[PDB]
């Protein structure tokens, strides 16, 4: 985890949480806090990239979080203006793009001959006023294999993570999804789009038919089913049956405020009873035809309370 | 929730959803006004406009600007107050009552004052 | 510019003889009038009318200055003026013509306004008259002053204008005024960049105008001549 | 508040103001057309109902609600649905048939198991007797109309152009008609089902008049509403125009500075 | 004043009205008995001293008032200066439909049609 | 049709190339639909 | 034709296009293609300007197309910045105006004493997302006597040439029109003006007046579509614009206005070549010629 | 009365109307009209400041009027750009605040120990299409003790003086006002300031 | 036309007019629904939507994204199918049948496979 331009206490507050979760034994924080020299800030991501390049080179897989490049560039701007190199756009240096491109390319998934080690990058970038068309974001946006857009509007109306499905992509796509998740997530992302579609046409407040009301009911419940509390990552086999219940429309006759309680009450029951499925999904990662059956049965069962 | 606790946590979120919705509609209401909103929407707005006015508070230091002697509400006081409004337990009160007063008691006061 | 001593203590209407004008948007004597509208609205006819009427009714000459002139229109004007006999090659003219066209370089286009103004200022001080000085177009004077600034390598101000923009106008406008000897009143064509009354140029210009005269397409189309809009053309001397 | 945005933002409002101003003028012509059908129906209400004035007929309730399927016309449906609930206090268990969806949607949310039948495809053109008879017929059909102790039609009455009025009017049935105080004055030959017909045809006729008045009250509302939309988007356009020029302006200065600074070095 | 179609309202003072009542034709006059009758699908006529003007009609209601005003109400409606082949070609399709609830409606057409032929 | 409508078949057999300029041709075309409603849920759709 | 910073293959093809219409024989291409030194791209239009003036000065007439001035300004910019002359708005030098004023002021109609020769100017200016406030378009618009205005919107509608009529003006105007075309078209700008104002009414219950206005407009707009490379002779325009304006197309459907023009003109050629000849020769329309055309039209429209 | 960037004509008539009301006898006018040098128009408010300062020092009361600061700021932008200091927002030098701050800070009320002299700044900002949010206005509002925002939309409707209530505020006078009025105007401020948002929800 | 023939050029122009209209009407569709439309228009929109979809196509390369097999279409097959679509010889088939398929064969194939 690379801390760039963060205040120290904020890096503290964070390593605490990592420890509160016994997560520190497998992490390395690299800190170039707010007060440190511009050169250290600019450098950190590079030094860090190397620290985790060790893992990739040696058959293992690291994960590098650059939090955040907007500041690295602020600082890299600072070296240059003071070294007196003439400035680019918004006073940045001319190759502020090269800056990031060469870092981010250092993330890769090596071939068998080279040990199959990977390095995976989650850079962070902070915008202003939602503008993604400002210099740096634009730069990095086109450097990476996709983005997750978070939005304030989404947040305050209760979608948390405030991911913007509309705009978020992974360009690798399904290649990196688990087969089981893939199977029951067939078309969800496109559907969720169609959902915003019908919900925009809903603003006309002109009567709906059985087709639009239908997809509205499901989209609303799907939306709600993806909401998630901070600090609670879920196992795949917890995720899978949730998604399956939503997609195949077993949630569609259930009150919206109650979908909260559905989630945990469902999982509680699946662990209790059909644990043999949950453990297959996990072990196998792929819903065989009979496993779809057991799951199908299992869900219906429970929805009738 | 780990700090303020599930209720204060939730009274907060729900207040924000309400306000954020009011905000989303600012445009339709600006052109079409209220009559074009649905029923659920319509309520949220009247409620949000109440929550909004209720968030205002007389300050003792700013007395030479309100005129009304300033108030200090407490944390437990505030949460309950807002929760009640979000359960619509006050819907029947003129929006003005929520403006520039202390806790929920002051609302029922001013509304009786004005309903005379 | 005539010192704070030589100043007029009272504002005063200049009679033009045009009903619309005098009744609704009356002119300052030694004042400045922003004239608005492009073609199809008889602008030059109306200008000539004032040159004639200021000469005939009062008894003072006029100086028409072409700042950033389209040359075509200089040839038109000059001919149209002869044709209307405000210019009289054989007898007497009522108007001196000082042209400074587009094709001329930025220095030229900046100074022409003064070139003409100087001429007009002679008839107010030497011959103590109530002279008309026309400026078409006061905006392109601005424009030109910007180019001079850029070429002189000075840092552009806000919206790329000359840092000098205010004082530049001042120096010009402050010579256009009433003295105890007489008065120079000015009618200045005003173009408005991107239709934005808040753009530095018009902004800074309006700072000196005392009355706008807005001719209008709607008004000509209704057959009304002059095509002055009775509602828009407002005088800040109608108190 | 970028320039790219503000521009297109300002466009789609101009495009809205256009539509709303079309709407207004289109209603103006449509209200002229539905003005003549509100004089030819409120006159046939004269010849009909006068018989009832002379034989003064005084009245499981059947409430028929009338509006349209169309929104974009202010509180037509909103405040008609309220007078229908005001009267639906004194009989919580009274059956409703709704004509037009917007009213059905309104009541469906508040007396959800009161309504037994619903009609649609209405407030598009001026209503005709042909409809007014088919609804009257189906009210006789599935709804078991005559077998009701009481029937009242609810409609928006047009008081002027700027204002309308939620209104009610009584339908009387076969028994009420015979039983009316001065029925005796009228030498109506008891020659087979004679009050029945008068009812069956006072249900279609009364219904028509209401619909004519309801539609012509709605058209007025649509006109007035669309009118205000044009005023607002009008005022909005003005604001965004001012904001546009600011952004433009700064875009020029901030863009320029980038060059000046690059240039001094 | 008092004789209305829903789309078009017609008449106003009258000296003699002829109507096609429930049971056979009738004639209201200067003072007449207050009566209601179903109006059968047939011709009608107004009077203003010696003025002959006959209309056809769909049917409806007549109502002679105690205050003496006669009110006549029908749906659709000049005499032969209104409605031969227009009738004929329709009469064909009418009779055809009868041989078919749906064909019951055509029964209504035969009687209404046959009547109009006489005009 | 009915009695309620009796005089709307006697007026629509008696409708059917003259007066039908807008007025009557349109008085003849009605675009209404009814639907019965049960325990919220409906019944089925049909032309009036 | 002054080609500025165009792909050579384009120019090559523009050549191969005039030779295909036997137009080369009276045309000159000054070529300053994409890949050439900026000075040449800066110079070409003045260079070609002086070529035109030859004809102007010698009692003849040229017309000169600058394709385009946008790219000339871009070139001038390159030179200046490199010479480290001080930049203004969008990094153009102060005298970028003076650049274009000098160029276009050279175009004129000279007086009798000067041989009465003439030079006409068709500068091309490329907007970006339609921005007439853009630095260069501003300068140039304020130098010229008007604009012919194009829009991809109108273009995808199929209206080609894609001329926005409401936005296009020629300050010279009236004075420059075949009197005959100006005779049957003083109404045309009128009709198409009112058609732009009742346009959104194209979406059920319109009164016969504003119904009619939509009836002319569509037909008229249709009449001004014109496949590429097929420009029409005046004596071939005035009939079509006549039948249009005076309401002889309102009967015809909107899709047939295509084949209408073709068949009308070829018929007018065979059966009325004499009226066409008078228009082409006299350049004006007799009170008789107006009844001639009227009669020939009413005959073709009936047929 | 400082007359920063004004016309020679405007000032004449402004003196005339001050003599027409006799108020000349008790007033000093300093003017740097639109023709005069940039550093004159810049130095003008400051020198007026000292002129007024004399009264505040010798135990009297003076009322200085800065008409306007926006034209003063603009003269500064002049010099600052000719001296080739970098342009900030709207091409203004980074110190344009300090210009006005260090000026206004002189208008002031003294303690009983220093004679209790007083000097009352009435600066004038002039906005652009009604813009409060602008870089100059903000600077001056973040300097002054409140503002009297005069809105054009009201003034076009014949409301004079067109004071927008919910955008004007006195910050330190609501304890300086004559008792009598404060008694009789209980809360009148936010009455009207929240009266404006209501009547703007009727049409 | 000189390069591709008239028919190709005419189809290509009409497809363009269609979509241009459909684009122009998206104002009136938002505001006054699909309800408030001329009948020709209602059909133009119906046809434009069908057309939008027939312009998409599964790439072979992008199988990782659609899981749908790559379909390649012959230029003559393109023009013929769009021609057909344009003259209404396909107005009955549902919108989804044109989406992510190859030639008009595939439109029919899908239409039935889904109606099953």
Question: Helices and strands in order, then pairings?
Answer:
The structure is cut from a larger assembly and holds three copies of chain A, three copies of chain B, one copy of chain D (265 residues), one copy of chain E (119 residues) and one copy of chain F (48 residues).
Chain A: E1 2-4, H1 8-20, E2 30-32, H2 38-57, E3 61-67, H3 69-83, H4 96-104, E4 108-109, E5 118-123, H5 135-143, H6 152-156, H7 179-184, H8 188-201, H9 212-225, H10 236-247, H11 259-272, H12 275-284, H13 289-303
Parallel strand pairs in A: 1-2, 1-3, 3-5
Antiparallel strand pairs in A: 4-5
Helix pairs in contact in A: 2-3, 4-5, 8-9, 9-10, 10-12
Chain B: H1 6-31, H2 39-55, H3 63-66, H4 75-86, H5 104-114
Helix pairs in contact in B: 1-2, 1-4
Chain E: E1 16-20, E2 25-29, E3 36-39, E4 44-46, E5 53-55, E6 60-64, E7 70-74, H1 85-98, H2 104-117
Antiparallel strand pairs in E: 1-2, 3-6, 4-5, 6-7
PDB class: membrane protein
Keywords: Complex, Proton transporter, membrane protein
Entry title: Mosaic model of yeast mitochondrial ATP synthase monomer
Binned, the helix content of chain A reads 40-55%
Shape of chain B: globular
Tell me the name of the CATH homologous superfamily of the largest domain in chain A. P-loop containing nucleotide triphosphate hydrolases
CATH architecture of chain B: Orthogonal Bundle
The proportion of residues in beta strands of chain B is under 5%
Tell me the total number of β-strands of chain B: 0
Q: Give the class-level CATH name of chain B.
A: Mainly Alpha
For this structure, the CATH topology of the largest domain in chain A is: Rossmann fold
Q: What does the radius of gyration of chain B come to?
A: 15 Å
Q: Which fold name corresponds to the CATH topology of chain B?
A: Bovine Mitochondrial F1-ATPase, ATP Synthase Beta Chain, Chain D, domain3
> What is the helix/strand order of chain B?
HHHHH
Number of strands of chain A: 5
Give the count of structural domains of chain A.
2
- Structural domain tally of chain B: 1
Element order of chain A: H for helix, E for strand: EHEHEHHEEHHHHHHHHH
How far the N terminus sits from the C terminus of chain A, by CA atoms, comes to 44 Å
- Quaternary state of this entry equals part of a larger assembly
Q: Give the class of chain B from helix and strand content and strand pairing.
A: mainly alpha
CATH architecture of the largest domain in chain A: 3-Layer(aba) Sandwich
């Amino acid at each position: 985890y690379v801390a760039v331009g963060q205040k120290r206490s904020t890096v503290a507050q964070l390593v605490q949480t990592l420890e509160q979760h016994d997560a520190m034994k497998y992490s390395i924080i690299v800190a170039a806090t707010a007060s440190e020299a511009a050169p250290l800030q600019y450098l950190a991501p590079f030094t860090a990239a190397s620290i985790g390049e060790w893992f990739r080179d040696n058959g293992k897989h690291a994960l590098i979080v650059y939090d955040d490049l907007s500041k690295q560039a602020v600082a890299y701007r600072q070296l240059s203006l003071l070294l007196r190199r003439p400035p680019g756009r918004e006073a940045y240096p001319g190759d502020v793009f090269y800056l990031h491109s060469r870092l981010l390319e250092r993330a890769a998934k090596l071939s068998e001959k080279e040990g199959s080690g990977s390095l995976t990058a989650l850079p962070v970038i902070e915008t202003q006023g939602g503008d993604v068309s400002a210099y740096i974001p634009t730069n990095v946006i086109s450097i990476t294999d996709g983005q997750i857009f978070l939005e304030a509007e989404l947040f305050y109306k209760g979608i948390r993570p405030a991911i913007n499905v509309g705009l978020s992509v992974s360009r690798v796509g399904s290649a990196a999804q688990v087969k089981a998740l893939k199977q029951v997530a067939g078309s969800l992302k496109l559907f969720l789009a169609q959902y915003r579609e019908v919900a925009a046409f809903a603003q006309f407040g002109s009567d709906l038919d059985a087709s639009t009301k239908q997809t509205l009911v499901r989209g609303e419940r799907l939306t709600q089913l993806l909401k998630q509390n901070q600090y609670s990552p879920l196992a795949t086999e917890e995720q899978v049956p949730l998604i399956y219940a939503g997609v195949n429309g077993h949630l569609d006759g259930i009150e919206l405020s109650r979908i909260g309680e559905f989630e945990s009450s469902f999982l509680s029951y699946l662990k209790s009873n059909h644990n043999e499925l949950l453990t297959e999904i996990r072990e196998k990662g792929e819903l065989s035809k009979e496993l779809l059956a057991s799951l199908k049965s299992a869900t219906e069962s429970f929805v009738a309370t | 929730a780990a700090v303020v606790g599930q209720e204060h946590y939730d009274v907060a979120s729900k207040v924000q959803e309400t306000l954020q919705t009011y905000k989303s509609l600012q445009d339709i209401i600006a052109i079409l006004g209220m009559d074009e909103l649905s029923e659920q929407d319509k309520l949220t707005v009247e409620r949000a406009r109440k929550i909004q006015r209720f968030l205002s508070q007389p300050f003792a230091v700013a007395e030479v600007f309100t005129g009304i002697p300033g108030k200090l509400v407490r944390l437990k006081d505030t949460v309950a107050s807002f929760k009640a409004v979000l359960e619509g337990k006050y819907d029947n009160i003129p929006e003005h009552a929520f403006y520039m007063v202390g806790g929920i008691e002051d609302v029922v006061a001013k509304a009786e004052k004005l309903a005379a | 510019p005539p010192s704070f001593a030589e100043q007029s203590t009272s504002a005063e209407i200049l009679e033009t003889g045009i009903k619309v004008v005098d009744l609704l948007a009356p002119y300052a004597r030694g004042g400045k009038i922003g004239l608005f509208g492009g073609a199809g609205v008889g602008k030059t006819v109306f200008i000539q009318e004032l040159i004639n009427n200021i000469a005939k009714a009062h008894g003072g000459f006029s100086v028409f200055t072409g700042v950033g002139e389209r040359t075509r229109e200089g040839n038109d004007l000059y001919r149209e003026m002869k044709e209307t006999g405000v210019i009289n090659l054989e007898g007497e003219s009522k108007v001196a013509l000082v042209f400074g066209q587009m094709n001329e370089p930025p220095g030229a286009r900046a100074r022409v306004a003064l070139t003409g103004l100087t001429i007009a200022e002679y008839f107010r001080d030497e011959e103590g008259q109530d002279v008309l000085l026309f400026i078409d177009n006061i905006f392109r004077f601005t424009q030109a002053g910007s180019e001079v600034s850029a070429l002189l390598g000075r840092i552009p101000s806000a919206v790329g204008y000359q840092p000098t923009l205010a004082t530049d106008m001042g120096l010009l406008q402050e010579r256009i005024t009433t003295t105890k000897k007489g008065s120079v009143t000015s009618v200045q064509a005003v173009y408005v960049p991107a239709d934005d009354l808040t753009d530095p140029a018009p902004a800074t210009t309006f700072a000196h105008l005392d009355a706008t005269t807005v001719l209008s397409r709607g008004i000509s189309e209704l057959g009304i001549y002059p095509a002055v809009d009775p509602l828009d053309s407002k005088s800040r001397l109608l108190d | 508040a970028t320039l790219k945005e503000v521009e297109m933002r300002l466009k789609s409002i101009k495009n809205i103001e256009k539509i709303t101003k079309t709407m207004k003028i289109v209603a103006s012509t449509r209200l002229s057309k539905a003005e003549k059908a509100k004089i030819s129906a409120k006159k046939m209400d004269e010849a009909e109902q006068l018989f009832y004035k002379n034989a003064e007929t005084k009245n499981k309730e059947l409430i028929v609600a009338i509006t349209s399927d169309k929104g974009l016309c202010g509180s037509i449906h909103s405040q008609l649905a309220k007078a229908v609930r005001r009267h639906l206090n004194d009989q919580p268990n009274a059956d409703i048939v709704t004509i037009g969806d917007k009213i059905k949607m309104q009541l469906l949310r508040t007396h959800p198991n009161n309504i037994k039948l619903s009609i649609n495809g209405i407030g598009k053109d001026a209503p005709t007797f042909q409809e007014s008879a088919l609804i009257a017929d189906k009210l006789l059909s599935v709804m078991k109309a005559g077998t009701y102790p009481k029937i009242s039609i609810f409609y928006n009455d047009p008081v002027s152009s700027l204002s309308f009025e939620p209104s009610e009017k009584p339908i009387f049935n076969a028994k009420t008609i015979e039983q009316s105080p001065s029925f005796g004055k009228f030498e109506i030959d008891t020659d087979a089902n004679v009050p029945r017909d008068l009812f069956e045809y006072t249900l279609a006729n009364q219904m028509l008049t209401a619909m004519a008045q309801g539609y012509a009250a709605e058209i007025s509302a649509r006109r007035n509403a669309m009118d205000n939309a044009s005023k607002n988007a009008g005022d909005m356009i003005n604001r965004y125009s001012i904001l546009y020029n600011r952004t433009r302006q700064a875009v020029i200065t901030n863009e320029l500075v980038d060059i000046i600074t690059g240039a001094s070095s | 004043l008092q004789f209305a179609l829903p789309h078009e309202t017609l008449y106003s003072e009258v000296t003699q009205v002829n109507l096609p009542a429930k049971s056979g034709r009738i004639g209201v006059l200067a003072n007449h008995v207050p009566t209601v009758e179903q109006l059968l699908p047939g011709v009608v006529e107004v009077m203003e001293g010696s003025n002959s003007k006959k209309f056809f009609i769909s049917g409806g209601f007549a109502t002679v008032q105690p205050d003496s005003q006669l009110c006549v109400t029908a749906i659709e409606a000049p005499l032969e200066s209104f409605s031969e082949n227009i009738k004929n070609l329709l009469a064909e399709a009418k009779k055809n439909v009868s041989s078919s609830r749906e064909a019951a409606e055509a029964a209504i057409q035969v009687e209404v049609l046959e009547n109009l032929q006489s005009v | 049709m009915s009695y309620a409508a009796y005089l709307n078949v006697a007026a629509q057999a008696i409708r059917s190339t003259e007066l039908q300029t807008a007025s009557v041709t349109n008085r003849s075309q009605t675009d209404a639909f009814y639907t019965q409603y049960k325990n919220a849920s409906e019944p089925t759709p049909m032309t009036k």
